[PDB]
Amino acid sequence: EEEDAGLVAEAEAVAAGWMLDFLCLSLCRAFRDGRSEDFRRTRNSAEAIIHGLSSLTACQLRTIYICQFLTRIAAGKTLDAQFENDERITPLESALMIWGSIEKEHDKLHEEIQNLIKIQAIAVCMENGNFKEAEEVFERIFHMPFKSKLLMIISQKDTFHSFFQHFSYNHMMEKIKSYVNYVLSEKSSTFLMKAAAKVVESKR
Amino acid sequence: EEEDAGLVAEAEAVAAGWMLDFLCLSLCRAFRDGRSEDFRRTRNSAEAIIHGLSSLTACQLRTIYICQFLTRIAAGKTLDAQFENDERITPLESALMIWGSIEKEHDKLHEEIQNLIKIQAIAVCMENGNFKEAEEVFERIFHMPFKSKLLMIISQKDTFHSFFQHFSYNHMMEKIKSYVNYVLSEKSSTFLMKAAAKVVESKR
Ligand SMILES: NC(=S)Nc1ccc(OC(F)(F)F)cc1
Ligand SMILES: NC(=S)Nc1ccc(OC(F)(F)F)cc1
Ligand SMILES: [Ca+2]
Ligand SMILES: [Ca+2]
């Protein structure tokens, strides 16, 4: 009776762990495929499932961090979004913090994604006329010639600057998409996806 | 490439169908066990998953209706809740509508649950001093001596009436709990629960 409820609670935690892993892989695929509405709906589902979990493995935690990074990148141009308690932190800044916090290899792609997020953290402020906010973002983030080039753009208020087109928002998105693809490779092995795929194939 | 994405979308629909069935059984168990917070968190998860589904089988639809009934019964005393577009409809009234709409057998238990919900739809208005609202609930719902007994209580404003203790809120809850148990029996066969349970047992 008391031990029966304990078995039930354990089974529900195993099932929730599977649902989280499936939702996390489905969210990454949507980001990669540009399916914004699916991303939005899958994120809501993943967040709710997390609220119903208590124990998280290191792999599940790292996986949750990846989904948060993607969510903030997707809201990168939404400066009215507050993802941190400090209301001064921009979405792209919050993503950078996560990117630097994820337990992952620091390969060339990692640094390129990092540097593109820093450039775009400033560019989205300039592109909304928020020149004082770009200066504040710049100080919280800041590569000496790279740093001095950005400050020069902020002070002159040149919003449509050529530098921001060479290291554009699309460029940042594509490199982030390349990373997700590598991740998606590793998560196509999840239990729920594998089982569902077999059913689909069984009916083909 | 185009057919690959189609297979992926099909597999995600099969996985979502499994997640819905698991969440629906977990929600019923919490209601039965009196775990209110788990019910609240599981309901949020189930609602999000539904927003990510397009096709629903008749069994999945009937199952969704059961969960909605339970949600409204749980908010039966929350008269500030609007579950219907008509803001005049009380939560218990909305549950009664669903109870009369579910494709299920109309056994003695079915009618008893129905009659107890009708009594309590009036009793929760009286118990908040909302005597005019009890009269409006009464007209939208209304067994001639049964009907005339309730109107007599409403007009005399007797809120703590003995009739409302014989056919009490707890009594309505217990009979609804008996039904869920029968339902829970049939849903313990779901794929996710079965698989998770095996894992738990494999580690016992
Ligand atoms: N507001 C935000 S960024 N919250 C959030 C939490 C968790 C999360 O991972 C996921 F649930 F999707 F797996 C994504 C976003
Ligand atoms: N507001 C309400 S009553 N909405 C709701 C929708 C669906 C539902 O079934 C479930 F998702 F839980 F399976 C429960 C409640
Ligand atoms: Ca702002
Ligand atoms: Ca009201």
UniProtKB/Swiss-Prot annotation, chains A, B:
Function text: Binds the telomeric double-stranded 5'-TTAGGG-3' repeat and negatively regulates telomere length. Involved in the regulation of the mitotic spindle. Component of the shelterin complex (telosome) that is involved in the regulation of telomere length and protection. Shelterin associates with arrays of double-stranded 5'-TTAGGG-3' repeats added by telomerase and protects chromosome ends; without its protective activity, telomeres are no longer hidden from the DNA damage surveillance and chromosome ends are inappropriately processed by DNA repair pathways.
Cross-link entry Glycyl lysine isopeptide (Lys-Gly) (interchain with G-Cter in SUMO2), positions: K149
Tissue expression notes: Highly expressed and ubiquitous. Isoform Pin2 predominates.
Taxonomic classification: Eukaryota, Metazoa, Chordata, Craniata, Vertebrata
Phosphoserine modification, residue list: S155
Record region (TRFH mediates dimerization): 1-204
Substitution effect: A16P: Abolishes dimerization and telomere binding
Reported effect, F22P: Abolishes telomere binding
Name listed for the protein in its UniProt record: Telomeric repeat-binding factor 1
Cysteines engaged in disulfide bonds, as pairs: none
Full-protein residues shown: 60 to 268 of 439
Organism: Homo sapiens (Human)
Assembly description: Homodimer; can contain both isoforms. Found in a complex with POT1; TINF2 and TNKS1. Interacts with ATM, TINF2, TNKS1, TNKS2, PINX1, NEK2 and MAPRE1. Component of the shelterin complex (telosome) composed of TERF1, TERF2, TINF2, TERF2IP ACD and POT1. Interacts with RLIM (via N-terminus). Interacts with FBXO4. Interaction with TINF2 protects against interaction with FBXO4 and subsequent polyubiquitination and proteasomal degradation. Interacts with GNL3L; this interaction promotes homodimerization. Interacts with TIN2. Interacts with RTEL1.
PTM text: Phosphorylated preferentially on Ser-155 in an ATM-dependent manner in response to ionizing DNA damage. ADP-ribosylation by TNKS1 or TNKS2 diminishes its ability to bind to telomeric DNA.
Compartments in which it is found: Nucleus; Cytoplasm, Cytoskeleton, Spindle; Chromosome, Telomere
